[PDB]
Design a protein around this ligand. Sequence first.
Ligand SMILES: *[C@@H]1O[C@H](CO)[C@@H](O[C@@H]2O[C@H](CO)[C@@H](O)[C@H](O)[C@H]2NC(C)=O)[C@H](O)[C@H]1NC(C)=O
Ligand SMILES: *[C@@H]1O[C@H](CO)[C@@H](O[C@@H]2O[C@H](CO)[C@@H](O)[C@H](O)[C@H]2NC(C)=O)[C@H](O)[C@H]1NC(C)=O
Ligand SMILES: *[C@@H]1O[C@H](CO)[C@@H](O[C@@H]2O[C@H](CO)[C@@H](O)[C@H](O)[C@H]2NC(C)=O)[C@H](O)[C@H]1NC(C)=O
Lengths: 49, 150, 116, 195, 146
Amino acid sequence: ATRNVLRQLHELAPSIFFYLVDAEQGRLCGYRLRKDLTTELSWELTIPP
Amino acid sequence: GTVGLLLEHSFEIDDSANFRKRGSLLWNQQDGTLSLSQRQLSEEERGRLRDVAALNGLYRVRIPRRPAGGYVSSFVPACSLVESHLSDQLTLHVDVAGNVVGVSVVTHPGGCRGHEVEDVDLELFNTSVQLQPPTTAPGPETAAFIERLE
Amino acid sequence: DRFKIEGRAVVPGVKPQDWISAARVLVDGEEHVGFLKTDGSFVVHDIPSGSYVVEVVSPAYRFDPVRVDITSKGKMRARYVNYIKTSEVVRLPYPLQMKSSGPPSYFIKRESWGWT
Amino acid sequence: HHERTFIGIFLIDGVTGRIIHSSVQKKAKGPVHIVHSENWVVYQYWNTKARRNEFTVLELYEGTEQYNATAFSSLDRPQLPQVLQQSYIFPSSISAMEATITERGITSRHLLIGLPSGAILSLPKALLDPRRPEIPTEQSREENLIPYSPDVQIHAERFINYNQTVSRMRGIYTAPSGLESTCLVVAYGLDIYQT
Amino acid sequence: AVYEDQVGKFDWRQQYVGKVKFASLEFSPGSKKLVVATEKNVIAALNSRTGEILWRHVDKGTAEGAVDAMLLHGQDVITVSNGGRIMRSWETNIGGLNWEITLDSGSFQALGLVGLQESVRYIAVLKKTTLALHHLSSGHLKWVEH
Ligand SMILES: *[C@@H]1O[C@H](CO)[C@@H](O[C@@H]2O[C@H](CO)[C@@H](O)[C@H](O)[C@H]2NC(C)=O)[C@H](O)[C@H]1NC(C)=O
Ligand SMILES: *[C@@H]1O[C@H](CO)[C@@H](O[C@@H]2O[C@H](CO)[C@@H](O)[C@H](O)[C@H]2NC(C)=O)[C@H](O)[C@H]1NC(C)=O
Ligand SMILES: *[C@@H]1O[C@H](CO)[C@@H](O[C@@H]2O[C@H](CO)[C@@H](O)[C@H](O)[C@H]2NC(C)=O)[C@H](O)[C@H]1NC(C)=O
C-alpha cells in the first residue's frame, strides 16, 4: 500500500472487477472496485440448490 | 397459465442503487411466450439519463425471483443506450425445472462514438424480449459408424 | 445383498512369488480394490448387483479386463468388454481365469542392416 | 437415480454476467474433470445408460469478420459466438487432467491424463476436434481432416512414464521452461514424479 | 519415455507413505524389515539398513480403508480394517497374502491373540455385541458368542 500504488489504483479503479461464488446457496455475485478502494454490487445470478 | 414479473430500472449521477418500477413481463409457460408492458420516460427522467450518459454512468435492470425473496440484475453503459435511440434487447435465462436464473441486457449497436442526440429521439422504447432455456448436449453417435464399418 | 468375486491370475514361465508383491486387482476403476494371495488367487468382497469391469494392474505385465454381470439373486456371469455395441455377449469361464500376454512395450524400436 | 441425473455447463462472462452458453447433459454422473483453454473446453464424465466414460469438447468461433481488431471490451460485444460440440468414448477412468504450456504457444497442444493405474497418457488435442465430418467430402480433404470416429484408443507407447507409476494421483503441473519445444511436467500424488 | 536410452537422464520419482499409526519391529532379526501402517490407508515394509521400500500396498483413500487394528505373530501380520469388517493375514517375507475374511456386522472394540498349552492357535475379535474366535492358520471361524 505505497503512495504510488495508491495513486495508480485511484486512477485505474473502474477497470477492475471481482466475482464471488457461494456454493452453499448457489449464488454468484459481481462487484466493481471504486476510487476509494470500496466495492459496489454490479451483477447477480442465482442457481437453485 | 400466465405469470407477471416486475421489472425495475435504475440510473443515477453517482452510480447508486435507486431502483423504481419500469415495466411488467407476462410469461406463459404453456406455449412458452414472453411479453413486456412498459411506460415511456418522463421529462426529468430524460434529463437525468442525458446527464448519466454524459458522465459515463450505468443503467441497471433488476427483476425478482418469485412471481423480498431475492433479485437478479444486470447493467449496461448508459451512453451506449442513449446513442442507440433506446433500442435494446433483454434475455431471460431460465432453469431446466422452470426457475428464473438470470437477466441480460444488450444494445444494438454497441460502443460510444460520442454523437449528439436531441430530446425528440428519446420518446419510445424499441425493446426486444427473449426467453432462453438450456439446450441439450449431443451424444456419441455409433450406429452410423457401425453400419459404415460393415 | 452383498457378494464376492473370485478368480486366479497366472503368468506363463514365471512362478507367482516374483510378481504378486506389486500388483492389485481393480473393480470398476478403483471403486473396489483387492490384493493377490501367495499362489495367485484373489477375492473381492462386498460387490452389489449390477455390471462391473474387473482388471489386474501390475507395472510389468499385461492383463485383459473382463466384464462381470451379477444379478439380484447372486448368480453371476463373465464376458468380454466392449463399449461399442454393448449388447454383444461372448461367454468367458467363471471363476475368472486371467492369463497374462507378456510384458508391455513402452518403447519404440529402430531399423537394422538393409542389404546383405 | 440412474435415470434422472444430469450435469449442467454454464459459459458466463465475468464482467457483465451474460450467460454466453447454457447446456445440460442427461444420464450423466460425476466426478467431472474439465480443462478450459484459449478457445475451447473439454470435460469428461460418466454415462450410466451405457456405463462408460465420455469426453465432451466445446469450441467457440466468431463470424468471418473481426468486430474490433484493436481491443476487446466486454461492455461492447453485443453478438453471441458460435458454439460447436462433440463427444467421444474413453475406455478407462481418469484421476487427473491437465494441458501443456509453452512460451509462445507455437507447438501443438496435448492433454496429460492421469489414470488410476498410475500411468500418464499424452493425448493430442487435434484428435478432439468438433469440425471432424461424419461423411468425408472434398472440402474435408482439402482441409485435411480425419473422418469422425467414436472411440479413442490407449496405447502403451504414448505413456510419458515408462514404469515409474504414480499411485493415488492428485495433481499435474506444467511449466514453459524457456524453450519453444520442451515443457516441464510434475505429477504429484502419494509419489512425486518429474520429467 | 522413448528409445529406452534416456531412462533416468531427465526424470525422477520419489515414493512416500503417510504418517505412521502402527508399527512392529520385533523380528528374527536376521532379516532386516520394518512393517508399518500409515494414516493414508497404506501398509508397507521398509528396509532397516537404508530406509527404502521392499513392498507397499495401498487401499481405498476414503474412510472405507482405514486400518483399525494390527498385530504381529512370527513372520505374519494380522490386520483388521474397514470399520471392523475385513480381516487379513499378510505374509511379511514375500509381501503377498495368506488369507482374507469378512467378519459379521458391528463395531470393532479390541483385537487379541490367545493360545493353549504353550502354543498360539486362535485370534479373538471383540465387537460391541459379540465375541468371536477364529483359527490362525486358515482364518476359518471357530466359534462366536453373545
Ligand atoms: C429497433 O430495434 C432493432 C433491434 O435490433 C434494431 O435492429 C434491427 O432489427 C431488425 C430485426 O431483425 C433488422 O432487420 C435490422 O437490420 C436491424 N437494424 C440494423 C441497423 O441492423 C432496429 O434498427 C431498431 N430500429 C428500428 C426498427 O427502427
Ligand atoms: C475498438 O475498440 C477500441 C477500444 O474501445 C476503440 O478505441 C476507442 O475508440 C473511442 C471512440 O471510438 C475513443 O474515444 C477511444 O479513445 C479509443 N480508445 C483506444 C484505446 O483506442 C476503437 O475505436 C474500436 N474500433 C472500432 C472500429 O469500433
Ligand atoms: C522399468 O523399465 C526399465 C527399462 O529400462 C527397467 O530397467 C532395466 O532393468 C533391467 C533388469 O534389472 C536391466 O537389465 C536393464 O539394464 C535396465 N535398463 C536400464 C536402461 O538401466 C526397470 O528395472 C523397470 N522398473 C522396474 C521397477 O523393474
